[PDB]
Amino acid sequence: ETLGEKWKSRLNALGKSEFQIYKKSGIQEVDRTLAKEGIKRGETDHHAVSRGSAKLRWFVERNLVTPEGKVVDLGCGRGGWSYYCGGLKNVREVKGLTKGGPGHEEPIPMSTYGWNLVRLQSGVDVFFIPPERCDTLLCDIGESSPNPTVEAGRTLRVLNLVENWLSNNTQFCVKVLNPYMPSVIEKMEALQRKHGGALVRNPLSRNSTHEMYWVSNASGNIVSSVNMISRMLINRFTMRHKKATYEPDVDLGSGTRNIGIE
Ligand SMILES: Nc1ncnc2c1ncn2[C@@H]1O[C@H](CSCC[C@H](N)C(=O)O)[C@@H](O)[C@H]1O
Numbered sequence: 001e002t003l004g005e006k007w008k009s010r011l012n013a014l015g016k017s018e019f020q021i022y023k024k025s026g027i028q029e030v031d032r033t034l035a036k037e038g039i040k041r042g043e044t045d046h047h048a049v050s051r052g053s054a055k056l057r058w059f060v061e062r063n064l065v066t067p068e069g070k071v072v073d074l075g076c077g078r079g080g081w082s083y084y085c086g087g088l089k090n091v092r093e094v095k096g097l098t099k100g101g102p103g104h105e106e107p108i109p110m111s112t113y114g115w116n117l118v119r120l121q122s123g124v125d126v127f128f129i130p131p132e133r134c135d136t137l138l139c140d141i142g143e144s145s146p147n148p149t150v151e152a153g154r155t156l157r158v159l160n161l162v163e164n165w166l167s168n169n170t171q172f173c174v175k176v177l178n179p180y181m182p183s184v185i186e187k188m189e190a191l192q193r194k195h196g197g198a199l200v201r202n203p204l205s206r207n208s209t210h211e212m213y214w215v216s217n218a219s220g221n222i223v224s225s226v227n228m229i230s231r232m233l234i235n236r237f238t239m240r241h242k243k244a245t246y247e248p249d250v251d252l253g254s255g256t257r258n259i260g261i262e
């Protein structure tokens, strides 16, 4: 029921080569080369396990999401979001959960700052476990599909999932894979009405996804928000100068935290 649908078809209609070029046109990138080589080498200090750490950092260093207390990371994969939160000031406990298993990102043990406050377990399907009480809820789940109706389903599953974990003034950051499909817009509107927050586009996301994140400390008419991104993604189809701007990767430190305010 929208304009992002025009974008998706155009996207799908791209040639393999055209596609790769577009996917990174004028986006923001994280310089991960050395971080990956160090990880591959067994290093467990400083490195982010994925570009997700840098991704979360962007929202956090802007107070769009303020992870505190018990943080639950739904679909932590390797744990970029979890290890990152494990080094943040007022965070006490970090629990990350994923499916893992062959053909899936499995959590990677690390000794980055606060790693001791972080527990990651795979072999978990978040959709069928009971909700635990938590102060901040993070969720980065959402598999992309060439078929926008398939994505719309996946998106809703996630929204319903999180609604079940959100309480009082729970802090949250949740990926909304396909925010432009009308059932997803409809649900988002309900949620926003019920828990506030807004949808925000992360400059680090690639042009090949219309993904937006529902963050707790931000507002803005949903529909308006998605169209903005839709127009933007379309504008980017036709670009002179398609370079990606890079930035150093995040450094996650290497110690253990003792907690206890003091
Ligand atoms: N039902 C489910 N239960 C648990 N994990 C799931 C799931 N469906 C998908 N996932 C997982 O969710 C992950 C999302 S990608 C993880 C990104 C992470 N924030 C990064 O920074 O490291 C995938 O690795 C996938 O295996």
Ligand SMILES: NC(=O)c1ncn([C@@H]2O[C@H](COP(=O)(O)O)[C@@H](O)[C@H]2O)n1
Pocket: 011, 012, 013, 014, 015, 016, 017, 019, 023, 144, 145, 146, 147, 208, 209
């Ligand atoms: N035109 C192509 O050659 C091509 N390849 C992938 N895509 C679009 O982008 C989406 C996911 O992006 P990616 O495959 O992980 O980069 C797909 O689901 C599809 O809609 N398009």
